[PDB]
């Protein structure tokens, strides 16, 4: 009875965090769509940046004062989301604790498309 | 054996609930701007038809959007006349205006956030030259 | 995805559907009146040429637009009656008539709203000239 | 291990008691949005058809069977528009023509039995002066 | 559709509605310029015909459009004053000088450009 | 959780997304029908100006539209043959045809749904009147 | 220790039975976007009334890369797990077909769209 | 809530998030294409009128759009130069340009993805067909 | 409106703008043709009258001056496209010639008259 194995918590923890990042990314990808839809000339995208995308997203459950307190946090192998403002790309990263290979999501609105 | 399972549940329930929530009404406003800009060209088409149906198109008479009335299909329900149908813009009583004395049609729109106004003009005589 | 976005979809549709819609009917009367006047000039040219073809141009016999038939091509649908080529007066059907006993051609138009009518006159008798 | 085995029962008893939500939500009021756009669709079709015969001022008597070849088949490859326009109470199309009055009526009625809604279009009469 | 189609349908309108508007009355007045010339030709033929009326075609008398009126028909309105059946301009668009046997037609456009002149003489050349 | 997936994942998306689709073909017919007529009238004006140039306007030797070619300007993209400029209908490839035996010019059109045809004719023969 | 044999008796829900209503949804909502793409493309070329030889490899510029940044369109659409796109173009028929089959082997469902000579022609 | 239930909530999200995303820009430039095709036919109407209004229409002089300016109205912002009204393209920035010596009007359109260009052309100076 | 609706106007405009248009110059020179063929008979009647009265410079007083008071008939007679009078005389040949050349580079057309040696075989 003493020999029964005990599983580690971190294995279930990390694989849930991997779901959180993957949800928030898919919300930001339509928030930014609304911003480009509503900039004063929507036909010519201009200098999107995360701090100015803020008013489309609700406060955290503590009613704190900025979305860096709401969007998720990661090692980024610290904000789990970043904008490459001059290159017009959004990137979201999940880094495992165990040394497994990292997962990076991406979105890209500057006329690149699939080109294939 | 089960207690580890239960505390695992208690952790994951905590961390998946933190997901951020979008804000309602955020994009809603600029549809009205789209209505204004699409309805302006429709009034330009109407006024440019009336200007051709009068007897002396070389020397046109006055216009007001009351005389312009019989072109706008009565607003999808029992309603009296076109002022009931053209977009409202209470913050800036009718979105459409005619300077009946100086032959100028103007449409205007203004966000609530204090950004600068949108204005559109059409001016149907002796204009266009540099 | 989540509820809020799918609510704003409904709101945007409810707004965008409320653009006004233009009427079907406009500007028809001047189009009819223009064909009337241009066709009138063509009938005046036809009858003026016909007077030169009788055995004595100074004293022609009776003229009727049924006699004037061989000057006008068939209708574009290949129907052959001259009256099926000329415009219709929708007050009631040719908008053109000949006062055969008094040498006068008359082309009439009546506005669709019932306003004031307009008439064009021509005659080939000597009474067509004055000092 | 009897201590943890004891408290496992307590944790189960607590976790099982959570409030369980119910299914309905917007599934009613979303259908009204199908109606609002499918109406403007039929108005665009009928406003094309009314101009195709040789006299746009004396059109023939429209029935939606004559309008039908403007609509695509249902995605399930059904064979007629009544299997495509939104259904309503038996009375089953929410849209009908009553050609003797020259009007198209589109309808809605909520499950709570509240105030019903009507959208009307008319190709005979339109807004009066003033 | 989902939201993206509804932002595309807003983006598209802003660049359909911008198509430029052509003016009105840009080309109106040159129809007067043309019908002035055709009426000039017809009046020239009429005054030429007039020389055959009196007993001696080698010694014709004075002429005015009042004398010449018997040679062309009443108005399409069936009114009969030829001073309104001729073309009209800032001035009758046509003139006769009994003292020089000269017939003149003239047209001046509203844009302030150069005036245009036509002339005929049945007496000497 | 599961049910607030369920509703948006199935119910509301199924209700909102499956509105009826307009048919992309049937709206084209009036545009084709119009451009046919406009080209017909301009071809008549051209041939009616070709006859008046001949050395013997009582007997123009023959007319086929290759001879008529230089009276209309070359199309956009500069595909400089006349047949490249006129309307097409493989079921009529020109939609206009010249009969050299009967001196007759013909135009023809047919709606894609298999409706009744329309035909136009012009004829400069002595058989072409009354 | 006997109590553990009772505590262990709880039945396990089978994950496969919860998938169908999700895949069905991301077939329907994807089909409607491919149709909107086709219905735009058919108006872009120089002859609005004679189609080109449409195939989805030429629709490709109308929708984004995968989140994995793999390019090409076929990597992006939903997969028929029986075998690989769940969306097919039958070029000869001008017909688009989309297919779904439940894992337990129930009756199939197909969506369809067709952009030539395809008015209903009621009764 | 039990773990074997709680993980399917993860699975459903992992499926439903992975829809395709439509690319805005490829829909946008299909509209800019239809500006070019409309504005070109307006410039043809203007230049074909101006050749008719000159002092001797058989002997037209050089043309520039600056000379052509008064024939179409100034833009909705009451900006006062023709060049601001006409559409813009990277092949410029005006998409429309006139060859003063070869008497040719050229409109060019460049796809945003760097694909194959498209050009429209008109030529009033006696070039004709065949 | 929605895209399914909105793109059909793009279709319709793309169709309506394709209508062909007539060539201006191909009427205009076939008009000029008529003043050549007609004024040829005016010159013939004048010079035939002159040879009964007992180069076009000698003929000049026999015909009316232009409506804009040009200085002589050489400015009233029509203009040759080739290279300027479209009419010429040669008193070494007793011959009058008139010519028209089309703008397309197609077949040129020539009239002739002589006050001697009419008639054949």
Author numbering:
A (entry chain E): 16 to 92, 100 to 138
B (entry chain I), F (entry chain A), H (entry chain B): 1 to 92, 100 to 137
C (entry chain C): 1 to 92, 100 to 138
D (entry chain H): 2 to 92, 100 to 138
E (entry chain F): 1 to 91, 101 to 134
G (entry chain D): 10 to 92, 100 to 139
I (entry chain G): 1 to 54, 64 to 92, 100 to 137
Quote the study's own text.
T4F are defined as helical polymers of type 4 pilins. Our 3.7 Å resolution cryo-EM structure of S. sanguinis heteropolymeric T4P and the resulting full atomic model including all minor pilins highlight universal features of bacterial T4F and have widespread implications in understanding T4F biology.
This made it impossible to precisely calculate the helical symmetry operators for the filament, which could nevertheless be estimated at 11 Å in rise and 93° in twist angle. As PilE1 and PilE2, which could not be distinguished within the final density map, share high sequence identity, we arbitrarily chose PilE1 to produce an atomic model of S. sanguinis T4P. In our atomic model, the pilin subunits display a canonical lollipop structure in which the α1N portion of a 52 residues-long α1 helix protrudes from a globular head. In the globular head, α1C is packed against a three-strand β-sheet, which is flanked at its N- and C-termini by two regions with limited secondary structure elements, a large αβ-loop and a short CT tail, respectively. Critically, as in other structures of bacterial T4F11, a portion of α1N is melted, the extent of which varies slightly between Ile16 and Gln28 in the different chains. The filaments are right-handed with four pilins per turn, displaying approx. 11 Å rise and 93° twist between consecutive subunits within the 1-start helix. Perhaps the most unusual interaction is within the right-handed 1-start helix, where the CT tail in PilE1 (mostly negatively charged) engages the next pilin αβ-loop (mostly positively charged) through electrostatic interactions. At the level of the left-handed 3-start, the melted region in subunit S is held in a groove between α1N of subunit S+3, and α1C of subunit S−3.
